[PDB]
């Protein structure tokens with residue numbers, strides 16, 4: 001299926017079945033999306049919700065986070081694991097306070113220059129909060145695209161990662177980008193799961209190569225040897 | 226453990242781990258709580274969220290629901306199953322429009338007189354939306370209380386149902402009732418599950434008889450013969 005059909009199908013799915021109501025999806029701002037995405041990167045949504053709420057209550061703005069002692073941040077993080085994320089979160093908040101006047105930056109380069117924020121997270125922050133036209137490529141999205149398009153290789157190989165970014169760019173619209181990127185993450189989290197994907201529930205099932213061949217276990221490739 | 230300790234433990238749990246952010250939990254009103262509770266009674270939360278959102282968008286008030294054609298209600302219900310709920314929902318909305326001026330009633334008798342609303346649902350509507358001091362007793366709550374208190378009998382027997390209502394009354398506080406009743410429903414849905422309850426995650430584990438005896442399978446009793 002052509003890229004414009006992929007987009008349309010994902011957006012139609014999101015409208016009827018998507019996750020739209022989580023706390024970081026209401027009255028979205030760059031700060032809220034960044035905080036949530038950092039929390040979500042290594043933690044499931046159900047675990048994250050109470051931490052996001054406690055963080056937003058304690059730190060309503062990025063300057064509040066910046067000005068807090070690191071030990072208080074780490075205390076509030078306790079139980080999320082992967083504390084390098086918290087150390088970077090705090091440093092990034094301080095960079096936003098120091099370099100950007102306390103206003104979370106709204107341009108890609110400046111977002112991507114923050115500690116703890118890579119190309120995909122920067123694209124997520126600006127597409128979800130502001131509708132800027134950037135694609136994403138987290139683990140979940142890699143799996144959806146690798147299955148749909150039979151990307152056999154290990155995404156730890158630069159050439160393979162680049163192929164996946166190209167595919168993501170190709171399917172990602174400008175109109176509705178906030179909805180499409182959330183939908184792709186939702187699909188990878190809840191439908192196109194690591195094991196035994198729920199293809200009958202997937203809006204891509206009519207063009208996905210893995211579904212056609214029952215070969216989801218091949219994609220993405222795993223690390224060699 | 227004494228009833229006041231049961232309450233306190235449930236409320237402390239809810240504060241750190243409870244579900245607080247679902248759409249029917251924000252800017253709560255009697256109408257929103259009633260709609261959500263009817264949807265939730267035979268359908269899981271993940272399935273309900275998009276239907277609740279579509280209903281609230283199409284029917285912002287109970288008079289809007291009342292004045293709509295039944296066939297439109299049933300069309301929007303499609304996929305939730307158990308359509309007697311939808312038929313009663315519509316009749317109840319019409320009763321609220323006709324008898325109560327379009328303002329969802331805020332007193333127990335008038336709520337409990339609505340089609341599709343029993344004693345527990347009426348108590349849920351008024352406790353969650355307004356903080357009125359009523360206990361609840363749905364299937365999930367029956368299971369939590371029957372396990373904690375070793376209620377061996379089948380809740381289809383009046384005497385057993387009455388015992389469970391008495392226990393619910395005993396543990397239900399006035400202060401924080403909205404939080405306690407949501408928490409009890411959350412516990413029964415996610416922790417004290419029908420099979421293999423997650424007792425190590427449960428705030429009642431230090432006084433629950435079933436946990437002490439590893440005897441959760443006995444409670445509540447199942448229907449005889």
Ligand code: SF4
Nearest residue numbers: 192199202205208211
């Ligand atoms: S059809 Fe199946 S394998 Fe293909 S993207 Fe959807 S869930 Fe994944």
Ligand code: SF4
Nearest residue numbers: 417424427430433436
């Ligand atoms: S301790 Fe176990 S059996 Fe007892 S109420 Fe909690 S989850 Fe249920």
